[PDB]
Design a protein around this ligand. Structure first.
Ligand SMILES: Nc1ncnc2c1ncn2[C@@H]1O[C@H](COP(=O)(O)OP(=O)(O)OP(=O)(O)O)[C@@H](O)[C@H]1O
Ligand SMILES: Nc1ncnc2c1ncn2[C@@H]1O[C@H](COP(=O)(O)OP(=O)(O)OP(=O)(O)O)[C@@H](O)[C@H]1O
Ligand SMILES: Nc1ncnc2c1ncn2[C@@H]1O[C@H](COP(=O)(O)OP(=O)(O)OP(=O)(O)O)[C@@H](O)[C@H]1O
Ligand SMILES: [Ca+2]
Ligand SMILES: [Mg+2]
Ligand SMILES: [Mg+2]
Ligand SMILES: [Mg+2]
Lengths: 337, 98, 314, 205
DNA sequence: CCCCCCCCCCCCCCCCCCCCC
């Protein structure tokens, strides 16, 4: 692809003698590296950088006004994936973003898997009903996939989504558009993400990725004396997930575990904090926290569950309350803080 | 990026280009960095990433952190003023004080 | 990118079939490549030969090897549930103890965990039509509280032969955590030769409370526990056996005498189903669902009789 | 550490106390006129005197090695042509950071960076010796990976260039909350090496 | 032969009677 440019024949001959293949190859190196390779001088090396940089992109001017006004041209800035409940959508101001990793962390029995299943079901609805008209990919890491609960949810779906007409519901093939994968190791998870997910995403069979418990293998394979390889693996995984989500305009939902706090990270008066440290926290866009209070349900009788927004570039820190029943996860009206 | 020498060379070149641009076009250049953990004497402290030689690149360095529940801004380095610490908060209207 | 279903014309499919499939909503060859045969059959004007030929033509244009949800559900319809000897507990669990997963039960002393373990170790050998699993049982004991006479009593209750029941149980005693892991390795090596239907660890957290004693050894304790639970999960997934473990409790001093299980978040996340056992009245006990991915929280009452775990009498 | 502060104080003192011309070469944007005015205000109160002192300091911006070499050669030519004159000749030259313009050229298996930095050292030595001037440069600090000892950057070849070296440091964190800096004589040709002193940046202003 | 860099882990554990018309 280096011959599409306009260079002097001597420069092209020199760069061909240096076994340089593409524009990414030449932009990968530095000025002194190209000086040592091509045996050129600074002005023509600078001109080569000029030409390559202009080749990658240029001549296009984008302003915030265009992003704000041209909604159809930029679906990332204006389109959100619904959660299946009006109250949760109101808490999230529309739903999940279409570009970036969204975390969901909490203690056991908080209700993360139920939310994952509900999102996997709701991603298949038409555009006007909050969906993306596509399937989903589910990756299991700790336990086996709960198929019985999925069958119950698919059966009960017409009774949860009241707004959608029944005729459109009848033609929806819920079970045929969900793909299930199983992973037993860190290397297996990395290989799966690198190979199987892009194939499914490119063909258009799915527009949502659920890594589920991402902390499960890292908690068991890396100790406190091997933080550097763990950080390297986490950075690679996060970079790959972000690249895939940006390329295919599909949300990525990750489920995380918590550890006892036992506050540089802003977790002073909290009992538990998300695991995997700050290296994993640096890769996220929206951070949520689902919690259950067992000391208050002992008085109420019914479980007390809250969903909280820890951090977001466009959402204030707030919370609401929800319940879990046979239909699925549903929010409680008039509880947002 | 496993070759750290290449990373340092690229970072130094970028810093030189940015300072040259700022001086030549009468601009203000703003860069945002991340924080990492330094493990010493069985104690963990948060330090800016990308190594020690990156500390010389910028002219002014600001550090944001939580103390208990408030947000603090510290003028870590500056060639014209003195080290201090102030309080700020984020409102629905944006970056504010108090 | 996606390939339109009009590609099927070149493969040797009549245009009428393509139009009918488009009417059915299949706008992409990838969508129809994973559709079930029954769905295609239920379409009017399509026979078994037509559906088979459409699937064969679409198979070589769409990559295979991905499992959908319908395939996963129809492959798991053979799952076995083992009876616990009590009708109320079977109703609460909706069939009994599931195979291929980890079930954990915890409570204070005397609440009746070892008795349930013995009853399961006996009833796992019943024929499937009687509520059993038709296999052997494995018992890993870390406290020295294994009594074959309870097994004999339960076998006599169910009308089996005591000698065969005792012959169909493998027993091992663990003295520390390293021996526990080594015994797990030996069990993995052993399960290949014969057929097993159950695996019992009782208890899974007794030795960790004292082997790693102090505040400064918490991390290593949790790491070792996580490795042990991962090995248990791998065994359960590979051999399709039911894994049942027991746990102890600790008192809540930071804020009705409340108690919580020991082990922190590691065992809570690793376990699939959690049952809470508390003392009732006389010989009657109460079982409560503490956590489950597919069961609402409820309660049931059982009793410990002279012939194992059973329903409360009157 | 306070290298820029020391250079600014030196420049102000030479421009006001001795009333001689000073040339400042800046390669990282660390020079500010407000700080120079603040330093001068602690030595005099006459506005005209302050303006006259400020007019005796020349500012030059160079962001790569070639610009710095061109500036130094131009200064050499100007001083050579300005032998007859005595009111206006530059007496002190300050290079704010030689490391900022040599670091991008060092690395890999090449050798051009070493040649360029040796050329820069030759230019500085010629300026210092032939024209009887005072040349002050600043450098970065590095720690040896195999020994854990602090050493100057730019390598062993650069270690031989200066005729006098001063090492600045912070006083163990505690007791050095501001201004309090630790000074040392890392290299010299007229004194034993190792003596230590105490400086306070806050009191200079 | 040539020059300079990386990052955390994890919950534990109950105590103790008072008071006659
Ligand atoms: N033959 C029997 N007939 C009736 N009840 C019996 C018989 N054998 C044991 N039990 C009952 O078993 C109860 C103890 O239950 P179990 O051994 O399961 O305790 P556990 O929960 O394992 O306790 P720990 O925490 O001390 O290990 C006793 O209260 C006793 O009443
Ligand atoms: N059919 C159902 N009806 C009502 N509640 C249910 C139903 N199925 C499951 N639940 C509830 O789901 C809760 C647990 O939710 P879930 O399995 O999503 O937890 P989780 O956050 O994924 O936990 P873990 O860390 O164990 O994976 C239980 O407390 C239970 O009450
Ligand atoms: N007016 C002032 N009053 C007090 N202290 C000041 C003042 N101006 C600057 N400082 C001090 O100067 C310090 C920085 O010194 P200086 O700018 O000389 O650093 P440097 O060694 O040149 O750094 P770099 O390597 O980043 O170029 C600050 O930490 C600050 O405390
Ligand atoms: Ca669990
Ligand atoms: Mg779950
Ligand atoms: Mg027992
Ligand atoms: Mg400086």
């Amino acid at each position: 692809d280096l011959d599409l440019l306009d260079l002097n024949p001597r420069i092209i001959a020199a760069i061909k003698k240096a076994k340089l293949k593409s524009v990414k190859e030449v932009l990968h190196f530095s000025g002194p590296d190209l000086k040592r390779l091509t045996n050129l001088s600074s002005p023509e090396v600078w001109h080569l950088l000029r030409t390559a940089s202009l080749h990658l992109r240029g001549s296009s001017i984008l302003t915030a006004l265009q992003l704000h006004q041209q909604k159809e041209r930029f679906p990332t800035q204006h389109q959100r994936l619904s959660l299946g409940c009006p109250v949760l959508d109101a808490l999230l101001r529309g739903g999940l973003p279409l570009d970036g990793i969204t975390e969901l962390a909490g203690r056991s029995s908080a209700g993360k898997t139920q939310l994952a299943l509900q999102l996997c079901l709701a991603v298949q609805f038409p555009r006007q009903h909050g969906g993306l008209e596509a399937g989903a990919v589910y990756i299991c890491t700790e336990d086996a996939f709960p198929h019985k609960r999925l069958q119950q949810l698919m059966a009960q779906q017409p009774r949860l989504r009241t707004d959608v007409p029944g005729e459109l519901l009848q033609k929806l093939r819920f079970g045929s558009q969900i793909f299930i994968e199983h992973v037993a190791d860190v290397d297996t998870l990395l290989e799966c993400v690198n190979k199987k997910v892009p194939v499914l995403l490119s063909r258009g069979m799915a527009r949502l990725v659920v890594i589920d418990s991402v902390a499960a293998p890292f908690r068991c394979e890396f100790d406190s004396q091997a933080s550097a390889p763990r950080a390297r693996h986490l950075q690679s995984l996060g970079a790959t997930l972000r690249e895939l989500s940006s390329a295919f305009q599909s949300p990525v939902l990750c489920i995380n575990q918590v550890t006892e706090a036992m506050g540089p990270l802003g977790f002073w008066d909290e009992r538990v904090s998300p695991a995997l440290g700050i290296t994993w926290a640096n890769q996220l866009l929206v951070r949520l926290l689902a919690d259950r209070l067992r000391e208050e349900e002992a008085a109420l009788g019914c479980p007390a569950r809250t969903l909280r927004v820890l951090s977001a570039p466009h959402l204030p820190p707030s919370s609401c309350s929800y319940t879990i029943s046979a239909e699925g996860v549903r929010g409680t009206p008039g509880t947002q803080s | 990026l496993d070759d750290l020498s290449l990373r340092t060379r690229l970072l130094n070149g970028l810093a030189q280009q940015m300072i040259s641009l700022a001086n030549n076009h009468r601009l203000a250049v703003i860069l945002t960095n991340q924080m990492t953990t330094k493990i010493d004497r069985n104690q963990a402290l948060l330090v800016p990433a990308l190594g020690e030689s990156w500390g010389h690149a910028a002219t002014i360095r600001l550090i944001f952190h939580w103390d208990r529940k408030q947000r603090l801004a510290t003028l870590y380095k500056s060639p014209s003023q003195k080290e201090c610490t102030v309080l700020f908060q984020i409102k629905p209207q944006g970056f504010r004080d108090t | 990118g996606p390939q339109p279903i009009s590609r099927l014309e070149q493969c040797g499919i009549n245009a009428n079939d393509v139009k009918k499939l488009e009417e059915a909503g299949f706008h992409t060859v990838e969508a129809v490549a994973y559709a079930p045969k029954k769905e295609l059959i239920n379409i009017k004007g399509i026979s078994e030969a037509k559906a088979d030929k459409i699937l064969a033509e679409a198979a070589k244009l769409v990559p295979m090897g991905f499992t959908t949800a319908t395939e996963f559900h129809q492959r798991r319809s053979e799952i076995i549930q083992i009876t616990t000897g009590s009708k109320e507990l079977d109703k609460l669990l909706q069939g009994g103890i599931e195979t291929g997963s980890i079930t954990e039960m915890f409570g204070e002393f005397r609440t009746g965990k070892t008795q349930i373990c013995h009853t399961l170790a006996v009833t796992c050998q019943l024929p499937i039509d009687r509520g059993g699993g038709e296999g052997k049982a494995m018992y890993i004991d870390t406290e020295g509280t294994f009594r074959p006479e309870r097994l004999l009593a339960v076998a006599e209750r169910y009308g089996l032969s005591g000698s065969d029941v005792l012959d169909n149980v493998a027993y091992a005693r663990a003295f520390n955590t390293d021996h526990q892991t080594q015994l797990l390795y030996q069990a993995s090596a052993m399960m290949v030769e014969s057929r097993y239907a159950l695996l019992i660890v009782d208890s899974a957290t007794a030795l960790y409370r004292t082997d790693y004693s102090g505040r400064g050894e918490l991390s290593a304790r949790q790491m070792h526990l996580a490795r042990f639970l991962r090995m248990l999960l791998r065994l359960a997934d590979e051999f399709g056996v039911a894994v049942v473990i027991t746990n102890q409790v600790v008192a809540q001093v930071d804020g009705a005498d409340p108690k919580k299980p020991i082990g922190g978040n590691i065992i809570a996340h690793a376990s699939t189903t959690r049952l809470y056992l508390r003392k009732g009245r006389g010989e009657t006990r109460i079982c409560k669902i503490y956590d489950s991915p597919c069961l609402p929280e409820a309660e049931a009452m059982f009793a410990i009789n002279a012939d194992g775990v059973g329903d409360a009498k009157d | 550490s306070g290298k820029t502060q020391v250079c600014l104080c030196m420049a102000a003192n030479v421009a006001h106390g001795l009333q001689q011309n000073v040339l400042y070469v800046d390669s990282n944007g660390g020079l500010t006129a407000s700080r120079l005015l603040q330093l001068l205000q602690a030595k005099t109160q006459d506005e005209e005197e302050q303006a006259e002192a400020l007019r005796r300091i020349q500012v030059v911006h160079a962001f790569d090695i070639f610009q710095m070499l061109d500036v130094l050669q131009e200064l050499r030519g100007t001083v050579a042509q300005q032998v007859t004159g005595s009111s206006g000749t530059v007496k002190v030259v300050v290079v704010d950071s030689v490391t900022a313009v040599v670091s991008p050229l060092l690395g890999g298996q090449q050798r051009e960076g070493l040649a360029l930095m040796m050329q820069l050292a030759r230019e500085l030595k010629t300026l210092a010796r032939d024209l009887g001037m005072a040349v002050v440069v600043t450098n970065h600090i590095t720690r040896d990976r195999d020994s854990g000892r602090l050493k100057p950057a730019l390598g062993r070849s650069w270690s031989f260039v200066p005729s006098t070296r001063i090492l600045l440091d912070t006083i163990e964190g505690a007791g050095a909350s501001g201004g309090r800096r630790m000074a040392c004589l890392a290299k010299s040709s007229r004194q034993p090496t190792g003596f230590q002193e105490m400086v306070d940046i806050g009191t200079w202003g």
